[PDB]
């Protein structure tokens, strides 16, 4: 009944928070990665979560001496001496389908290499990097429209789940170790991609080039650029410019068209900011005309505001309905964990118009959700003494 969670970001926090609610008797210790500066971004800080839940934050030296613990690495950044532990209960979540794509930038390389699938892998920590034996594995399908950001989010959801599904095997040490194949194993270092001098390579096929776009589309770090201008995805055209690859063929307000090894490509200029503004008040027929790629309906600005969030804070229900039919999350959250329902609560208070709630509820809105300060929409309504809207909302429970 002891566990050491060593790692970072949302998966570290999700697994930890699951444990606290569902196995309240377990003692939890944490180790944080070097560059966890204790501040939330588009990723939760695990250091911050741990300080706020009174989870003692230990070091690796101390971890070696805590004999009855299991040691769970959720993207931990430091090599560990597996034999130094007095037990063998040492696990790691790796964001790939091992033995492929060991190492770095696993939301990028599978896409770059034109993979259809990737995965998450729960394995033993061994003397190899990402090389210890497999315990549990999840194949993830990458969709042709999906970016690095989209795939990373799958890694988060699916890795969290993978841990939770297997948590008892781990806790009881009743799991089977199957050793990794050497065959088709791959590894990429941090040197494989220079994200500080990121340049698209057009001396490639059009298939490859779109796959670069997809792969490098991870807004919160960067977007790919063509001539100082951000791009959000692209498509293959039927034309084949004789121009040397890289040559810009046309240039207009919506796009750039380039010569590749084979088929020409359209790079769509990023209009995410325009779209998000429009979402305050535009109908879906107008918004649909603005979209050149589906994935952009689910992007977020620096606060974590998505199209569905903006639309909810402005009571733009007709648009919310459409967005959800395009696959948006009716319970989308910002980087404080603030839910769509919380944004709409604000619209309901500001407008006095409460009737739309049932519409959102029927779209899957969940009022029981808690933000990162652990407050529900009902809590906020009490703090602030808006008893009428509170009673109205309560009636749905």
Ligand X SMILES: Nc1nc(=O)c2c([nH]1)NC[C@@H](CNc1ccc(C(=O)N[C@@H](CCC(=O)O)C(=O)O)cc1)N2C=O
Site string for ligand X, 9-48 (x = CB under 6 A): ----------------------------------------
Residue 32 has what DSSP assignment? E
- Only segment of 14-22, 33-41, 258-266, 352-360 that touches Na ion (CB under 5 A): 258-266
Token readout for 391 is 């009673």
Q: In the complex with ligand X, which residue's Cβ is closer, 121 or 211?
A: 121
Beta carbon of residue 221, minimum distance to ligand T3Q (angstroms, whole number): 4
Q: Give yes or no for a contact between 98 and 134, defined as CB atoms under 8 angstroms apart.
A: yes
Q: Does residue 133 belong to the site contacting a copy of itself (CB under 8 A)?
A: no
Contacts for 110 with CB less than 8 Å, ≥ 6 apart: 96, 100, 101, 117, 118, 142, 151
Token readout for 131 is 């090389």
Nearest to 29 by CA among 65, 1, 62, 55: 55
Q: Does residue 208 belong to the site contacting a copy of itself (CB under 8 A)?
A: yes
Question: Rule CB under 6 A: which of 286-315 touch ligand T3Q?
Answer: 303, 305, 309-310, 313
Beta carbon of residue 190, minimum distance to ligand TYD (angstroms, whole number): 7
Q: Does residue 196 belong to the site contacting ligand X (CB under 6 A)?
A: no
Beta carbon of residue 40, minimum distance to ligand TYD (angstroms, whole number): 13
Residue 282 is labelled as binding a ligand: no
Beta carbon of residue 33, minimum distance to ligand TYD (angstroms, whole number): 8
Q: How far apart are the first and last CA of the chain?
A: 36
- Only segment of 99-107, 169-177, 295-303, 331-339 that touches ligand TYD (CB under 6 A): 99-107
CA atoms within 13 A on the CB side of 292: 18
218 binds, among ligand X, ligand TYD, a copy of itself, none (CB under 5 to 8 A by kind): ligand TYD
How many CB atoms sit inside 10 A of residue 144's CB?
Answer: 8
Among 18, 53, 57, 103, binds ligand X (CB under 6 A): 103
Q: Give yes or no for a contact between 312 and 340, defined as CB atoms under 8 angstroms apart.
A: yes
Residue 175 is labelled as binding a ligand: no
How far apart are the C-alpha atoms of 54 and 358, rounded to whole Å?
39
Among 143, 203, 384, 388, binds ligand X (CB under 6 A): 203
How far apart are the C-alpha atoms of 270 and 268, rounded to whole Å?
6
How far apart are the C-alpha atoms of 211 and 113, rounded to whole Å?
8
- Only segment of 129-137, 214-222, 223-231, 365-373 that touches ligand TYD (CB under 6 A): 214-222
- Only segment of 132-140, 217-225, 294-302, 381-389 that touches ligand TYD (CB under 6 A): 217-225
Q: Give yes or no for a contact between 273 and 261, defined as CB atoms under 8 angstroms apart.
A: no
Residue 133 has what DSSP assignment? P
Interface with ligand T3Q (CB under 6 A): 75-77, 94-95, 104-108, 148, 152, 195, 218, 221-222, 303, 305, 309-310, 313, 334, 336, 338, 342-343, 345-346, 380
């Amino acid at each position: 009944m002891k566990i050491i969670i060593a790692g970072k970001n949302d998966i570290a926090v999700n697994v930890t928070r699951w444990l606290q609610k569902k196995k309240k008797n377990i003692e939890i210790y944490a180790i944080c990665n070097a560059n966890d500066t204790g501040i939330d971004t588009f990723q939760r800080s695990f250091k911050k979560y741990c300080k706020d839940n009174l989870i003692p934050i230990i070091s690796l030296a101390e971890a070696y001496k805590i004999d009855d613990a299991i040691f769970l690495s959720l993207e931990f950044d430091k090599i560990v001496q597996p034999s130094k532990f007095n037990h063998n209960e040492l696990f790691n979540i790796h964001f790939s389908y091992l033995p492929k794509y060991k190492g770095m930038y696993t939301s990028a390389w599978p896409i770059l290499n034109g993979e259809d699938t990737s995965g998450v892998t729960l394995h033993k920590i061994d003397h190899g990097i990402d090389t210890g034996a497999i315990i549990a594995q999840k194949e993830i399908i990458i969709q042709p429209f999906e970016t690095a950001k989209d795939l990373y989010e799958k890694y988060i959801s699916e890795g969290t789940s993978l841990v939770i599904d297997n948590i008892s095997t781990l806790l009881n040490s009743e799991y089977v170790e199957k050793e990794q194949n050497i065959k088709y194993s791959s590894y990429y270092s941090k040197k494989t991609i220079d994200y500080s001098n990121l340049e698209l390579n057009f001396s490639k096929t059009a298939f490859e080039i779109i796959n670069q776009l997809r792969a490098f589309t991870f807004r919160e770090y960067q977007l790919p650029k063509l001539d100082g201008v951000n791009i959000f995805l692209g498509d293959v055209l039927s034309s084949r410019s004789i121009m040397k690859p890289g040559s810009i063929l046309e240039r207009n307000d919506k796009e750039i068209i380039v010569s590749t090894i084979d088929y020409d490509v359209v790079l769509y200029k990023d209009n995410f900011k325009e779209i998000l503004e429009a979402c305050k008040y535009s109908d879906s027929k107008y918004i649909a005309k603005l979209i050149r790629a589906k994935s952009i309906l689910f992007e977020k600005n620096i606060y974590g505001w998505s199209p569905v969030i903006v639309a909810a804070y402005h009571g733009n229900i007709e648009l919310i309905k459409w967005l959800v039919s395009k696959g948006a999350n009716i319970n989308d959250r910002n980087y404080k964990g603030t839910t769509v329902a919380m944004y709409f609560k604000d619209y309901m208070l500001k407008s006095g118009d409460y009737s739309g709630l049932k519409m959102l509820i029927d779209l899957g809105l969940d009022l029981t959700l808690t933000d990162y300060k652990d407050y529900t929409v009902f809590d906020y309504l009490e703090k602030s003494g808006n008893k009428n809207l509170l009673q109205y909302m309560m009636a749905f429970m």
